[PDB]
Scaffold this active site. Structure first.
Site, PDB file in Angstrom:
ATOM      1  N   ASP A   1       1.071  -1.346   0.137  1.00  0.00           N
ATOM      2  CA  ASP A   1      -0.133   0.005   0.077  1.00  0.00           C
ATOM      3  C   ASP A   1       0.816   1.217   0.195  1.00  0.00           C
ATOM      4  O   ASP A   1       1.620   1.402   0.704  1.00  0.00           O
ATOM      5  CB  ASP A   1      -0.665   0.152   1.269  1.00  0.00           C
TER       6      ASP A   1
ATOM      7  N   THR B   1      -4.308   5.064  -2.269  1.00  0.00           N
ATOM      8  CA  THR B   1      -2.564   5.562  -1.991  1.00  0.00           C
ATOM      9  C   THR B   1      -1.244   5.575  -2.509  1.00  0.00           C
ATOM     10  O   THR B   1      -0.951   6.086  -2.702  1.00  0.00           O
ATOM     11  CB  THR B   1      -2.367   5.883  -0.593  1.00  0.00           C
ATOM     12  N   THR B   2      -1.329   4.593  -3.401  1.00  0.00           N
ATOM     13  CA  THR B   2      -0.256   4.785  -4.565  1.00  0.00           C
ATOM     14  C   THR B   2      -0.502   5.548  -5.957  1.00  0.00           C
ATOM     15  O   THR B   2       0.264   6.148  -5.888  1.00  0.00           O
ATOM     16  CB  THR B   2      -0.106   2.865  -4.926  1.00  0.00           C
TER      17      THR B   2
ATOM     18  N   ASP C   1      -7.739  -2.522   3.741  1.00  0.00           N
ATOM     19  CA  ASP C   1      -7.458  -1.714   2.115  1.00  0.00           C
ATOM     20  C   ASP C   1      -9.482  -3.016   1.009  1.00  0.00           C
ATOM     21  O   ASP C   1      -9.646  -1.624   0.698  1.00  0.00           O
ATOM     22  CB  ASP C   1      -7.131  -2.147   1.176  1.00  0.00           C
TER      23      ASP C   1
HETATM   24  N1  ADP Z   1      -8.227  -7.190 -11.625  1.00  0.00           N
HETATM   25  C1  ADP Z   1      -7.908  -6.916 -12.831  1.00  0.00           C
HETATM   26  N2  ADP Z   1      -6.809  -5.908 -13.648  1.00  0.00           N
HETATM   27  C2  ADP Z   1      -6.775  -5.048 -13.629  1.00  0.00           C
HETATM   28  N3  ADP Z   1      -5.892  -4.035 -13.331  1.00  0.00           N
HETATM   29  C3  ADP Z   1      -6.778  -3.661 -11.727  1.00  0.00           C
HETATM   30  C4  ADP Z   1      -7.485  -5.427 -11.443  1.00  0.00           C
HETATM   31  N4  ADP Z   1      -7.301  -5.247  -9.837  1.00  0.00           N
HETATM   32  C5  ADP Z   1      -7.153  -3.895  -9.966  1.00  0.00           C
HETATM   33  N5  ADP Z   1      -5.930  -3.318 -10.725  1.00  0.00           N
HETATM   34  C6  ADP Z   1      -5.840  -2.147 -10.967  1.00  0.00           C
HETATM   35  O1  ADP Z   1      -4.601  -1.814  -9.628  1.00  0.00           O
HETATM   36  C7  ADP Z   1      -4.399  -0.520  -9.727  1.00  0.00           C
HETATM   37  C8  ADP Z   1      -4.425  -0.659  -7.858  1.00  0.00           C
HETATM   38  O2  ADP Z   1      -4.340   0.717  -7.090  1.00  0.00           O
HETATM   39  P1  ADP Z   1      -3.736   0.955  -5.755  1.00  0.00           P
HETATM   40  O3  ADP Z   1      -2.375   1.000  -5.153  1.00  0.00           O
HETATM   41  O4  ADP Z   1      -5.087   0.405  -5.143  1.00  0.00           O
HETATM   42  O5  ADP Z   1      -5.072   2.044  -5.364  1.00  0.00           O
HETATM   43  P2  ADP Z   1      -4.484   2.822  -3.740  1.00  0.00           P
HETATM   44  O6  ADP Z   1      -2.585   2.879  -3.794  1.00  0.00           O
HETATM   45  O7  ADP Z   1      -5.305   3.813  -4.121  1.00  0.00           O
HETATM   46  O8  ADP Z   1      -5.333   1.949  -2.818  1.00  0.00           O
HETATM   47  C9  ADP Z   1      -5.429  -0.154  -9.544  1.00  0.00           C
HETATM   48  O9  ADP Z   1      -5.607   1.557 -10.415  1.00  0.00           O
HETATM   49  C10 ADP Z   1      -6.835  -0.836 -10.480  1.00  0.00           C
HETATM   50  O10 ADP Z   1      -6.755  -0.203 -11.735  1.00  0.00           O
HETATM   51 MG    MG Z   2      -6.278  -1.031  -3.036  1.00  0.00          MG
END
Ligand code: ADP
Ligand code: MG
Ligand code: ADP
Ligand code: ADP
Ligand code: MG
Ligand code: MG
Lengths: 99, 155, 461, 392, 523, 101
Positions: D24, D57-58, D358
């Site tokens: 995260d 958050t990333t 999360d």
């Molecule tokens: N099954 C999937 N297929 C394609 N992309 C995905 C899938 N699951 C998650 N993602 C991508 O992975 C990213 C994870 O972001 P994340 O690091 O959770 O953001 P934050 O740090 O704000 O929680 C998302 O932007 C999403 O678009």
């Molecule tokens: Mg996430």
């Protein structure tokens, strides 16, 4: 000193002289309990006060003062005695005759 | 024409013998102890009063209670006086330093004519003047430096 | 405030300190005068004169300056309506400081602050009755003379009324608590009837300490020590505002400004020991949380408080030092009601008196007296140097006019105010101020001329 | 390289020596401790995304790292930074209108919509292979404590997470009762059915007051009146507890005096009463909401109405790191739940704790705003094409 | 004193490096915060060397100077000058720093002209007296017709917040600042407006709460919301009292009497709570901590208990509910209770806060600041504090002047008109006073990127013949009327910029010798 | 104490209360006594005179394994509904032979 928080409030004049006499009478109480069996040699592991030596002097008792704990268990088997820790609980089987 | 009461006693409320333990049992007798502690100090101030001793001098400190008592009765006091100054004060006014306030009389109090607190050199000084039976004196030096007055004292 | 590790210059620090402790106006001029006597003695030392012979010649020369300074001296101060010589005397002291923007306002503050606290029967002024407080904010024109006291108000209840119209002030020195003795008690509780007696003892004690104030007719209380939380709400129910945790000498100023008496206990309270005051209120200054006390109305108070305001702490701490010099020159007028005329007028007139008596007789100390008169002219020629003029051009004109006719109050100034008459420009200084400037600088010169060895060590360790 | 389902985790070893694996973006930037003053503002940006949304958050660092990277050519073209700040606000206000048109209004009653939302946030973490168990448990831990169709807020402090070492991630549990990490003294029973649980804040020990209390002994028989009256005092406290009808006691952790003495422990063992000590003062809010008990301070008010209820209150003797308590079933359960997280290492449980948080924060965003969009780079392309036509 | 130096580790300088170090150290302070003046000026980020550096971005000139720690002796006068400006009026700390530095920069130009420094002091005292009459005669008063006074208050908050981080939030933060002081309805205590900073959300999501927010949530087994309640607060001890008798023990003979005393202690604690509920209340706020024994008594009676809010938390609740502190409970007929409508708990940023919705006599507010980072929330709190302090004094002094460079050209015109009626000794020092007053619209014009050489020249030509309300228009970059655009400032703020800078420049210009002592533990 | 005559009655009571417990746990037939606390030199006399084995300062984990395997009850103090000294003598353990090898 006992294993407590004993503290005496001395208000009258006769109270301080009574405490110093009760300390002498307590030694005479335990020295009278050990001469009912008419011993000859008294051997202990702790200290002997001068008031305890006074009653054993006129009763013709030879007292040894600071014999070790390991030496008391060894003389208990040689003379056939039992190491007691209470002067008022002495019995005739606790006297090491046959030495 | 004042009278000086040279004392060796404490005029504070907290005058304790450092070994007294006042064990109380009830709340009716608890208030009687606190009223007695004020009555001990106020009895000493009544001995200085009713004798003409308008000026009080003591080598032991005086608290806030006895300071306000003399201000209401229009009396002056001075606490924490050094012992070298009270010995000179005794020979100046011709009195005697009384440790116990119970034996105060006209034969133990002093007598002078002019007693004021001036402003010589910025600091205040309570000077005594006018006594004809003065077996002592005081030479006040005034100079421009601390080493200047030490040489003037040595000269 | 210097770190000078020089034993000759350390005596100049104690010389300026001795002028501040005695008079307190010429602390700057007593160091320039002492350095002028030593500079004139340097050329006299090369001619073969003994240093004690110069020091014995300065005593015979300073004696002429003392007797000549007592020629023209008069004042008409009566402390009723003739405060005009008192204001113009304080303007000479405040004219050299940074308070020239308040040159008329702040000069009248220091005049009325002394006359309300001075004992004219003994000619004694006590500076403990004049409280000098300062708070940042406002301006220099907001400095007012508050007749009374100014303390930090500490109302324990936030819903306390912040304005009392007619205050019957009950000054006490006992904390609002059950009475605790000064000795060790260790009160014993045995039964539950004694513990229920503990609750009724304190409940009736807080109702006794509150009722004994209300029976005297008081509507304001001052306490040196703290308050209890149980005693705080009893103040609001009985409409009795009270402050908390006042200092030692602060409540001593309240009992004089209000005419009350400081009461040790609560049982000794009466209507005769109460103080009288008018507008009792707290004033918040901008965004801060100080809320100082302002006492507007009083009744024959013998204690005043000057509230100095400014733009920063540099202008306030200097105004505390500037106005203290103005409070001292009014004190010197009650000790001695004789004045002189400053601006270099008294130094030129005293320099002519030594030069006239140097020829009566010029036996041995002729050169020592002329070195004294040449050193007395350094103080008026330093005023000509700081004013952008020429020292030897301006001093020759003023000194020649005092010989051709009878010598008037003739000095100099910065903007010069037209003529050079110090009587018309109202440059008035005290007689005993300049009398101690010549006396202390001569004796400090004698202790630094009568020394022929230095036994200082080397390094520190 | 730590964004998306094909991203890898990062391990930050601090100066103390506690190295943790984190994916995260909020937990990475708080452990890196960047010394640059402009980079510390990006750490607090990912911190507020964990507070408001929880699952952003990333991505807030990739956007803010690229919005400033696009300003490199803008500042080398004579554009004032106030003009860039005015135009970034106009692109922001037009950006929300594009994402609102892509949104689909959903309802919290559909469990299949909430299941696909929680499974998306777990695809980027280490528990993507455990999405068949953790993602159903993340929906049931939220939708039973929110009381839906009545409120638009949910507190995540009512969901306790217990971290225990041992087993695998498939051994996680969604026990709706209370799970305590304290031990049972005495542990001779460790199981009671139809249990009535009572929270006691009174100290079962020798009588002492807030005031200083002393005992005066000045007689031979007065020593007998000290020990035998202290035994009769606590016997009146245990029999007052036993006559109420409770079997499980929860004693609050006392600091001033001793809460449960050795004399009081022996009477509670003979009454067949399970005693649990060292309950923290900050944890008594979670206990009274879960079981339904009331905090009993004085022994005179300890009645049967202030007790709880439990179908099974046993100490589950685990094979791993010790054992815990597990209350199964209670009458009128509150809006609280407990998630037990397992793991083979101490580093996997800390990642599984952040991945569950999360996942619970994704369903938290659906309570505040009942709308969702397509993921996997879907709205970033639509924000890139519609704002390009808006710039023309 | 340099020749044959009689100091140990101390150094000094007289009239050569004294005014040199004073003019270098004071201009560099004014040139530091020069870029933060105006509605288009940038901000600074303040950082330390380490060991909990705690970065704090500020645009206000007082917070920048109070944390830098300047080693220059004459620069500390301008640091202390801006500290008083923040404590008195709360605005113009940057404007008083540039104005005091531009006076000494013009005084450095009088070094080579061989002007006496006492002539510059006498020339600036007459220049400051002419500048006081320019602001006093141009001040606009507002008595009755309150619909024009509330519009005038929005121009004060719109001018103050334009020079801060809240640039494109004047449609919201002006209403959050005007209505906060308007709900006080009395003295400007500046502590009833409790500002709560919470992360998450933008600055447009911030709002002014209609009631009051608090922490330390309601008990364990107590109700969370009571409709139409009577709020009673307190400042008394609940449990472990040890009531005011120091040196009182419980000396008994047996342990059975100790059980009777501790039951008598809990009966007196129960009787104290029974005296509280005789008022007929539903909520309880204690400044001290509430332990477990009185907490069960409030929960059994259905009464709330808010334990240990704040020392100043019971003061804001007494001003927002209309009650009293009431630390003693023995007269229910003399204790005034508060009033409210809803005491429901709201969740702001995953934290449950106690919302006192629908209170009567609400002379207290709660600003819920929400920002992207902690650096924005620390800047928006100081930006709102610089706006609430002026409106708390605008309701006390309703005189307002036209800001945006219009007030500085009015002050510079009155000095220049009297500089021509003076002889040439002091007229040169008065012209340098008027040039430093024209630098304050020059810093504002050049920070935006405009032609500062022509806009101040157009302001000087406008104010020379009429146009008393003509000022600088920073929106389009031209000269407009300040009464039409609505760019006004308070009279007491603009007076303290003029007066404190003239007094602080008087001190530094009168310094001819800087004798610094030997510092401790510096080798 | 306020009277010196009541001094020795308190000093003897510190051992008479101690020897009161040691006589009612020993007259019921107990021969082996295990203690996790401490048995001082005064209490060792009552086991040598009666011919009983007294083991002191044993582990708390070892006492639970003996009392569960021998049917003994791990007792800490006096109990059983406001009794002076009862000890519940029917809850003693059993052993075939306790031998120190
Ligand atoms: N099954 C999937 N297929 C394609 N992309 C995905 C899938 N699951 C998650 N993602 C991508 O992975 C990213 C994870 O972001 P994340 O690091 O959770 O953001 P934050 O740090 O704000 O929680 C998302 O932007 C999403 O678009
Ligand atoms: Mg996430
Ligand atoms: N208006 C004036 N005209 C001429 N001389 C003045 C005027 N005002 C003050 N002075 C001179 O300035 C000098 C200031 O001395 P000062 O530094 O105050 O002495 P001190 O340090 O003892 O206070 C005085 O000696 C006085 O003669
Ligand atoms: N809308 C506007 N139009 C013109 N000038 C403005 C406007 N808003 C602010 N200003 C100017 O910007 C300056 C900001 O000064 P500031 O830094 O707030 O001083 P301080 O630090 O003392 O509060 C003010 O002097 C004001 O004249
Ligand atoms: Mg002077
Ligand atoms: Mg501003």
């Amino acid at each position: 000193k006992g294993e407590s928080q004993t503290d005496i409030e001395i208000t009258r004049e006769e109270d301080f002289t009574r405490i110093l006499q009760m300390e002498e009478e307590y030694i005479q109480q335990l020295c009278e309990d050990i001469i009912q069996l008419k011993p000859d040699v008294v051997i202990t592991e702790k200290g002997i006060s001068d008031l305890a030596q006074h009653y054993l002097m006129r009763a013709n008792i030879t007292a040894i003062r600071r014999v070790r704990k390991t030496d008391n268990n060894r003389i208990a088997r040689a003379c056939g005695a039992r190491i007691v820790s209470r002067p008022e609980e002495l019995r005739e089987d606790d006297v090491g005759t046959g030495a | 024409n004042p009278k000086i009461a040279l004392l060796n006693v404490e005029l504070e409320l907290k005058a304790e013998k450092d070994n007294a333990e006042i064990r109380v049992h009830t709340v009716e007798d608890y208030q009687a102890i606190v009223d007695a502690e004020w009555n001990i100090l106020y009895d000493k101030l009544e001995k200085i009063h009713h004798s003409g001793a308008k000026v009080v001098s003591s080598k032991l400190p005086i608290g806030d209670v006895a300071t306000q008592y003399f201000a209401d009765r229009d009396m002056f006091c001075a606490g924490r006086v050094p012992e070298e100054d009270l010995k000179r004060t005794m020979m100046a006014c011709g009195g005697s330093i009384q440790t116990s306030v119970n034996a105060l009389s006209a034969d133990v109090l002093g007598r002078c004519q002019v007693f004021e607190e001036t402003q010589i050199g910025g600091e205040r000084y309570n000077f005594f003047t006018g006594c004809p039976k003065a077996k002592t004196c005081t030479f006040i030096l005034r100079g421009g430096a601390e080493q200047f007055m030490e040489e003037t004292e040595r000269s | 405030m210097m770190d000078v590790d020089h034993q000759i210059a350390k005596l100049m620090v104690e010389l300026s300190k001795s002028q501040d402790d005695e008079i307190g106006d010429g602390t700057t001029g007593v160091v320039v005068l002492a350095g002028a006597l030593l500079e004139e003695a340097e050329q006299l030392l090369d001619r073969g004169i003994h240093p004690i012979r110069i020091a014995d010649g300065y005593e015979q020369a300073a004696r002429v300056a003392i007797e000549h300074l007592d020629k023209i001296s008069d004042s008409v101060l009566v402390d009723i309506k003739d405060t005009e010589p008192l204001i113009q005397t304080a303007k000479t002291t405040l004219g050299s400081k940074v308070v020239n923007s308040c040159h008329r306002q702040m000069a009248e503050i220091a005049v009325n602050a002394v006359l309300t606290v001075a004992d004219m029967e003994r000619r004694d002024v006590d500076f403990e009755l004049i409280k000098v407080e300062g708070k940042v904010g406002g301006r220099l024109e907001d400095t007012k003379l508050i007749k009374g006291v100014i303390v930090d108000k500490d109302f324990s209840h936030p819903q306390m009324p912040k304005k009392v119209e007619d205050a019957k002030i009950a000054i006490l020195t006992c904390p609002f608590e059950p009475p605790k003795p000064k000795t060790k008690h260790k009160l014993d509780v045995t039964s539950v009837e004694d513990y229920k007696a503990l609750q009724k003892y304190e409940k009736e004690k807080f109702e006794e300490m509150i009722q004994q104030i209300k029976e005297t007719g008081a509507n304001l209380a001052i306490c040196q020590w703290g308050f209890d939380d149980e005693a705080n709400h009893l103040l609001l129910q009985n409409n009795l505002p009270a402050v908390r945790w006042v200092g030692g000498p602060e409540i001593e100023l309240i009992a004089i400004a209000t005419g009350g008496r400081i009461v040790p206990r609560f049982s000794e309270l009466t209507a005769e020991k109460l103080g009288f005051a008018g507008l009792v209120q707290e004033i918040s200054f901008g965004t801060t949380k100080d809320k100082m006390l302002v006492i507007e109305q009083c009744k024959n108070s013998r204690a005043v408080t000057i509230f100095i305001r400014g733009g920063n702490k540099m202008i306030i701490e200097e105004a505390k030092r500037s106005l203290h010099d103005a409070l001292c020159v009014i004190r010197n007028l009650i000790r001695d009601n004789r004045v002189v005329y400053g601006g270099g007028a008294a130094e030129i007139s005293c320099a002519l008196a030594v030069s006239q008596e140097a020829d009566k007789c010029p036996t041995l100390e002729q050169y020592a007296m002329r070195a004294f008169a040449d050193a007395l002219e350094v103080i008026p020629m330093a005023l000509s140097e700081n004013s952008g003029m020429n020292p030897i051009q301006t001093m020759t004109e003023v000194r020649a006019r005092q010989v051709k006719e009878m010598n008037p109050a003739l000095g100099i100034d910065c903007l010069h105010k037209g003529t050079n008459d110090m009587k018309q420009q109202h440059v008035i200084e005290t007689l005993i101020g300049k009398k101690q400037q010549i006396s202390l600088a001569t004796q400090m010169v004698r202790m630094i001329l009568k020394i022929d060895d230095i036994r200082k060590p080397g390094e520190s360790e | 390289t730590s964004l998306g389902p094909k991203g890898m985790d990062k391990m930050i070893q601090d100066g103390k020596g506690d190295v943790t694996i984190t994916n995260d973006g909020a937990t990475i930037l708080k452990q890196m401790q960047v010394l640059h003053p402009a980079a510390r503002m990006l750490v607090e940006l990912s911190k507020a995304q964990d507070i408001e949304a929880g699952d952003g958050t990333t991505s807030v660092v990739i956007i803010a790292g690229s919005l400033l990277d696009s300003c490199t050519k803008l500042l080398q073209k004579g554009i004032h930074p106030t003009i860039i700040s005015e135009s970034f606000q106009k692109a922001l206000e037009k950006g929300i209108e594009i994402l609102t048109d892509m949104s689909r209004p959903v309802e919290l009653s559909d469990r299949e919509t909430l299941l696909n939302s929680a499974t998306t946030s777990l695809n980027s973490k280490v528990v993507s292979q455990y999405s068949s168990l953790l993602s159903p448990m993340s929906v049931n831990a939220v939708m039973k404590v929110i009381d839906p169709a009545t409120a638009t807020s949910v507190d995540l402090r009512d969901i306790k997470i217990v971290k225990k070492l041992g087993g695998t991630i498939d051994d996680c549990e969604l026990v709706e009762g209370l799970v305590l990490t304290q031990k049972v003294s005495n542990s001779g029973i460790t199981r009671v059915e139809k249990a009535k649980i009572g929270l006691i804040q009174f100290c079962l020990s020798a009588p002492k007051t807030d005031m200083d209390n002393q005992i005066v002994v000045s007689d031979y028989a007065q020593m007998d009146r000290v020990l035998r009256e202290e035994r009769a005092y606590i016997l009146n406290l245990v029999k007052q507890i036993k006559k109420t009808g409770c079997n499980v006691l929860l004693i609050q952790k006392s600091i001033l005096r001793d809460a449960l003495s050795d004399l009081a422990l022996h009477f509670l063992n003979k009454m067949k009463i399970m005693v649990i000590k060292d309950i923290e003062r900050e944890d008594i809010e979670f206990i009274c909401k879960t079981i339904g008990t009331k905090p009993v301070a004085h022994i005179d008010q300890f009645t049967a109405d202030m007790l709880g209820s439990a179908e099974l209150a046993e100490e589950v003797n685990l094979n791993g790191s010790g054992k815990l308590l597990k209350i199964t079933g209670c009458a009128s359960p509150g809006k609280t739940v407990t998630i037990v997280v397992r793991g083979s290492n101490k580093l996997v449980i800390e990642e599984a704790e952040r991945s569950i948080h999360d996942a619970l924060c994704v369903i938290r965003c659906l309570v505040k705003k009942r709308a969702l969009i397509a993921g996997g780079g879907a709205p970033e392309i639509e924000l890139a094409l519609r704002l390009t036509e808006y710039s023309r | 004193a340099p020749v044959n130096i009689f100091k140990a580790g101390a150094d000094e300088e007289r009239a050569e490096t004294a005014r040199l170090t004073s003019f270098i150290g004071a201009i560099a302070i004014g040139d530091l915060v020069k870029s933060t003046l105006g509605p288009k000026g940038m901000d600074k980020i303040l950082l330390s060397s380490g060991r909990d550096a705690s970065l704090m971005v500020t645009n206000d000139g007082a917070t920048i100077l109070k944390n830098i720690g300047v080693d220059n002796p004459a620069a500390k006068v301008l640091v202390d000058m801006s500290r008083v400006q923040d404590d008195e009026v709360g605005d113009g700390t940057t404007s008083v720093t540039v104005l005091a530095a531009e006076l000494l920069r013009e005084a450095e130009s009088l070094i080579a002209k061989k002007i006496h420094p006492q002539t510059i002091i006498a020339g600036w005292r007459e220049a400051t007296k002419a500048a006081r009459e320019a602001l006093l005669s141009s001040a606009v008063d507002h008595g009755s017709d309150e619909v024009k006074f509330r519009q005038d208050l929005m121009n004060i908050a719109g001018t103050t917040l334009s020079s801060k981080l809240l640039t494109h939030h004047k449609d919201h933060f002006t209403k959050l600042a005007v209505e906060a002081v308007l709900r006080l309805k009395g003295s400007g205590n500046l502590e009833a407006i409790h500002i709560i900073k919470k992360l998450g959300g933008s600055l447009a999501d911030s709002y002014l709460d209609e009631g009051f927010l608090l922490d330390k949530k309601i008990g364990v087994n107590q109700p969370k919301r009571i409709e139409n309640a009577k709020i009673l607060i307190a400042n008394t001890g609940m449990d472990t009292d040890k009531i005011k008798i120091f040196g009182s023990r419980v000396r008994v003979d047996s342990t059975a009497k100790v059980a009777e005393i501790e039951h008598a202690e809990k009966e007196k604690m129960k009787e104290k709570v029974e005296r509280i509920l005789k008022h007929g209340i539903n909520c309880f706020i204690n400044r001290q901590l509430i332990y477990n024994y009185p907490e069960q008594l409030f929960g059994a009676a259905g009464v709330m208990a808010i334990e240990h809010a704040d020392f100043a938390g019971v003061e804001r609740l007494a001003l927002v509910t209309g009650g009293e502190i009431a630390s003693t409970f023995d007269h229910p007929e003399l204790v005034k209770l508060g009033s409210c409508k809803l005491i429901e708990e709201v969740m702001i940023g995953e934290d449950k806060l106690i919302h006192f919705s629908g209170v009567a006599l609400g002379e207290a507010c709660t600003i819920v600041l929400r920002g992207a980072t902690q650096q924005i929330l620390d800047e928006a709190e100081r930006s709102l504090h610089d706006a609430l302090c002026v409106l708390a004094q605008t309701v006390k002094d309703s005189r307002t002047v036209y800001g945006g460079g219009c007030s500085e050209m009015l002050m510079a015109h009155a000095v220049t008109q009297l500089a021509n009626r003076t002889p040439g000794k002091e007229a040169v020092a008065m012209e340098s006073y008027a040039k430093a007053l024209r630098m304050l619209p020059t810093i504002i014009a050049d920070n935006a990127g405009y032609d500062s050489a022509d806009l101040v020249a157009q302001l000087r030509a406008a104010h020379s013949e009429g146009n008393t309300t003509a000022g600088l228009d920073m929106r389009e970059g031209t000269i407009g009327d300040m009464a039409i655009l609505g760019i006004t400032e308070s009279f007491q703020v603009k007076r303290q910029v003029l007066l404190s800078a003239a007094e602080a420049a008087e001190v530094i210009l009168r310094v001819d010798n800087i004798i610094k002592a030997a510092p401790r533990k510096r080798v | 104490i306020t009277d010196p005559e009541k001094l020795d009655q308190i000093r003897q009571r510190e051992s008479d209360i101690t020897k009161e417990r040691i006589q009612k746990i020993l007259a019921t037939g107990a021969n082996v006594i295990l203690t996790t606390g401490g048995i001082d030199d005064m209490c060792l006399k009552y086991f040598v005179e009666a011919g009983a084995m007294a083991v002191r300062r044993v582990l708390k984990r070892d006492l639970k394994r003996i009392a569960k395997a021998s049917g003994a009850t791990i007792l800490s103090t006096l109990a059983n509904l406001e009794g002076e000294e009862t000890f519940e003598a029917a809850m003693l353990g059993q052993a075939e032979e306790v031998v120190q090898e």
